[PDB]
Amino acid sequence: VNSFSGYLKLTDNVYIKNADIVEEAKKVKPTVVVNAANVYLKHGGGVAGALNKATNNAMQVESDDYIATNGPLKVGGSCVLSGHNLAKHCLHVVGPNVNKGEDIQLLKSAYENFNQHEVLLAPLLSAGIFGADPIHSLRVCVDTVRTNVYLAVFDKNLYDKLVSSFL
Ligand SMILES: O=C(O)CCc1nc2ccccc2[nH]1
Protein backbone atom coordinates (compact mmCIF):
# COMPACT_ATOMS: atom_id res chain seq x y z
CA VAL A 1 0.00 0.00 0.00
CA ASN A 2 1.16 3.63 -0.70
CA SER A 3 -0.05 7.27 -0.03
CA PHE A 4 -1.23 8.15 -3.59
CA SER A 5 -5.02 9.00 -3.71
CA GLY A 6 -7.65 9.50 -6.44
CA TYR A 7 -5.63 7.92 -9.31
CA LEU A 8 -7.24 5.95 -12.17
CA LYS A 9 -5.42 2.64 -12.75
CA LEU A 10 -4.38 2.27 -16.43
CA THR A 11 -2.24 -0.90 -16.12
CA ASP A 12 -0.63 -3.22 -13.55
CA ASN A 13 1.93 -0.44 -12.79
CA VAL A 14 0.74 2.91 -14.29
CA TYR A 15 -1.76 5.23 -12.59
CA ILE A 16 -2.98 8.72 -13.74
CA LYS A 17 -4.68 11.72 -12.11
CA ASN A 18 -5.67 15.32 -13.10
CA ALA A 19 -3.45 17.32 -10.74
CA ASP A 20 -0.71 19.97 -10.58
CA ILE A 21 2.49 17.87 -9.87
CA VAL A 22 3.66 20.61 -7.33
CA GLU A 23 0.51 20.34 -5.11
CA GLU A 24 0.64 16.53 -5.36
CA ALA A 25 4.32 16.43 -4.27
CA LYS A 26 3.64 18.83 -1.37
CA LYS A 27 0.77 16.56 -0.13
CA VAL A 28 2.36 13.07 -0.67
CA LYS A 29 6.13 13.83 -0.13
CA PRO A 30 6.94 10.87 -2.40
CA THR A 31 10.35 9.16 -2.32
CA VAL A 32 10.85 10.35 -5.96
CA VAL A 33 9.32 13.22 -7.92
CA VAL A 34 10.36 13.40 -11.59
CA ASN A 35 11.26 16.77 -13.12
CA ALA A 36 10.83 17.49 -16.84
CA ALA A 37 14.38 18.76 -17.06
CA ASN A 38 16.58 20.08 -19.89
CA VAL A 39 20.27 19.13 -20.29
CA TYR A 40 21.41 22.38 -18.58
CA LEU A 41 19.02 21.90 -15.60
CA LYS A 42 17.71 25.43 -16.30
CA HIS A 43 14.32 25.25 -14.60
CA GLY A 44 12.65 28.24 -16.30
CA GLY A 45 9.15 27.10 -17.20
CA GLY A 46 6.75 24.23 -17.53
CA VAL A 47 6.92 21.55 -14.86
CA ALA A 48 10.56 22.44 -14.07
CA GLY A 49 9.86 26.13 -13.49
CA ALA A 50 6.88 25.23 -11.27
CA LEU A 51 8.82 22.67 -9.20
CA ASN A 52 11.77 25.03 -8.84
CA LYS A 53 9.53 27.96 -7.77
CA ALA A 54 7.97 25.70 -5.08
CA THR A 55 11.52 25.10 -3.68
CA ASN A 56 12.16 28.88 -3.45
CA ASN A 57 14.90 28.42 -6.15
CA ALA A 58 16.86 25.90 -4.01
CA MET A 59 16.44 23.33 -6.84
CA GLN A 60 18.13 25.78 -9.29
CA VAL A 61 20.99 26.54 -6.86
CA GLU A 62 21.68 22.82 -6.38
CA SER A 63 21.35 22.20 -10.15
CA ASP A 64 23.83 24.95 -11.04
CA ASP A 65 26.45 23.37 -8.73
CA TYR A 66 25.70 19.92 -10.36
CA ILE A 67 26.27 21.31 -13.87
CA ALA A 68 29.42 23.24 -12.85
CA THR A 69 30.88 19.90 -11.60
CA ASN A 70 29.52 17.38 -14.16
CA GLY A 71 28.54 19.29 -17.30
CA PRO A 72 25.21 18.88 -19.07
CA LEU A 73 23.00 15.78 -19.09
CA LYS A 74 22.30 13.81 -22.29
CA VAL A 75 18.90 13.99 -23.98
CA GLY A 76 17.28 10.76 -22.69
CA GLY A 77 19.42 10.89 -19.53
CA SER A 78 18.83 11.77 -15.89
CA CYS A 79 20.38 12.60 -12.53
CA VAL A 80 19.17 12.19 -8.98
CA LEU A 81 19.28 15.34 -6.81
CA SER A 82 17.50 16.49 -3.69
CA GLY A 83 13.69 16.68 -3.59
CA HIS A 84 13.96 19.69 -1.25
CA ASN A 85 10.53 20.38 0.37
CA LEU A 86 8.67 18.34 -2.30
CA ALA A 87 10.06 14.77 -2.10
CA LYS A 88 13.04 12.80 -0.77
CA HIS A 89 14.69 12.87 -4.21
CA CYS A 90 14.10 14.57 -7.55
CA LEU A 91 14.87 12.50 -10.62
CA HIS A 92 15.66 15.11 -13.32
CA VAL A 93 14.85 13.39 -16.65
CA VAL A 94 15.50 14.92 -20.06
CA GLY A 95 12.93 13.99 -22.65
CA PRO A 96 13.47 15.17 -26.21
CA ASN A 97 12.22 18.71 -26.90
CA VAL A 98 10.37 18.65 -30.27
CA ASN A 99 10.52 22.51 -30.32
CA LYS A 100 14.42 22.04 -30.50
CA GLY A 101 14.29 19.20 -33.18
CA GLU A 102 15.36 16.26 -30.87
CA ASP A 103 14.77 12.55 -31.86
CA ILE A 104 11.36 11.44 -30.43
CA GLN A 105 12.84 7.85 -30.29
CA LEU A 106 14.83 9.25 -27.30
CA LEU A 107 11.55 9.36 -25.35
CA LYS A 108 11.81 5.60 -24.64
CA SER A 109 15.40 6.08 -23.33
CA ALA A 110 14.12 8.92 -21.09
CA TYR A 111 11.36 6.73 -19.57
CA GLU A 112 13.89 3.88 -18.98
CA ASN A 113 15.36 6.05 -16.17
CA PHE A 114 12.16 5.50 -14.18
CA ASN A 115 12.91 1.75 -13.93
CA GLN A 116 15.75 2.53 -11.45
CA HIS A 117 13.10 3.62 -8.87
CA GLU A 118 10.39 1.40 -7.36
CA VAL A 119 7.75 4.18 -7.11
CA LEU A 120 7.64 7.66 -8.72
CA LEU A 121 5.37 10.70 -9.01
CA ALA A 122 5.94 12.01 -12.59
CA PRO A 123 4.68 14.17 -15.44
CA LEU A 124 4.33 12.90 -18.98
CA LEU A 125 7.81 13.30 -20.49
CA SER A 126 8.21 15.56 -23.52
CA ALA A 127 4.59 16.86 -23.08
CA GLY A 128 3.63 20.50 -22.51
CA ILE A 129 6.27 22.99 -23.69
CA PHE A 130 8.54 20.10 -24.87
CA GLY A 131 6.19 19.78 -27.85
CA ALA A 132 5.48 16.01 -28.10
CA ASP A 133 2.00 14.45 -28.40
CA PRO A 134 0.98 13.56 -24.80
CA ILE A 135 -1.03 10.53 -26.07
CA HIS A 136 2.21 9.18 -27.53
CA SER A 137 4.10 9.99 -24.32
CA LEU A 138 1.57 7.98 -22.28
CA ARG A 139 1.87 4.98 -24.68
CA VAL A 140 5.70 5.03 -24.41
CA CYS A 141 5.43 5.30 -20.60
CA VAL A 142 3.11 2.26 -20.36
CA ASP A 143 5.26 0.23 -22.77
CA THR A 144 8.62 1.19 -21.10
CA VAL A 145 8.20 1.73 -17.35
CA ARG A 146 7.87 -1.47 -15.29
CA THR A 147 8.04 0.24 -11.82
CA ASN A 148 5.05 1.92 -10.24
CA VAL A 149 4.42 5.35 -11.76
CA TYR A 150 1.81 7.89 -10.63
CA LEU A 151 1.31 10.39 -13.49
CA ALA A 152 0.05 13.92 -12.72
CA VAL A 153 -1.62 15.59 -15.75
CA PHE A 154 -2.00 19.40 -15.29
CA ASP A 155 -4.71 20.13 -17.96
CA LYS A 156 -8.19 18.63 -17.08
CA ASN A 157 -9.10 18.65 -20.78
CA LEU A 158 -5.94 16.65 -21.66
CA TYR A 159 -6.45 14.27 -18.72
CA ASP A 160 -9.94 13.37 -19.99
CA LYS A 161 -8.61 12.89 -23.53
CA LEU A 162 -5.70 10.66 -22.30
CA VAL A 163 -8.11 8.42 -20.33
CA SER A 164 -10.84 8.26 -23.01
CA SER A 165 -8.31 7.41 -25.83
CA PHE A 166 -6.19 4.91 -23.77
CA LEU A 167 -5.87 1.45 -25.34
O1 LIG B 1 1.99 29.14 -10.20
C2 LIG B 1 2.89 28.28 -10.11
O3 LIG B 1 3.73 28.35 -9.20
C4 LIG B 1 3.03 27.20 -11.14
C5 LIG B 1 1.74 26.71 -11.78
C6 LIG B 1 2.15 25.56 -12.66
N7 LIG B 1 1.98 24.30 -12.31
C8 LIG B 1 2.52 23.54 -13.27
C9 LIG B 1 2.62 22.15 -13.42
C10 LIG B 1 3.21 21.62 -14.56
C11 LIG B 1 3.72 22.47 -15.53
C12 LIG B 1 3.64 23.85 -15.39
C13 LIG B 1 3.02 24.38 -14.23
N14 LIG B 1 2.76 25.64 -13.82
Q: Does the CB atom of residue 107 touch ligand 1 within 6 A?
A: no
Contact in structure between 69 and 14 (CB atoms under 8 Å): no
Resolution in A: 1.0
Contact in structure between 122 and 115 (CB atoms under 8 Å): no
User: Residue 113 sits in which domain range?
Assistant: 1-167
Count structural domains, the chain: 1
Paired with 35 in beta bridges are: 92
Which helix (H) or strand (E) covers residue 30, if one does? none
Q: Does the CB atom of residue 129 touch ligand 1 within 6 A?
A: no
> How far apart, in whole angstroms, are the C-alpha atoms of residue 87 and residue 151?
15
Phi, psi of 113 (to 5 degrees): -55, -35
Phi, psi of 8 (to 5 degrees): -90, 135
Contact in structure between 19 and 7 (CB atoms under 8 Å): no
> How far apart, in whole angstroms, are the C-alpha atoms of residue 79 and residue 5?
27
Q: How far is the CA of 144 from the centre of ligand 1 (A)?
A: 26
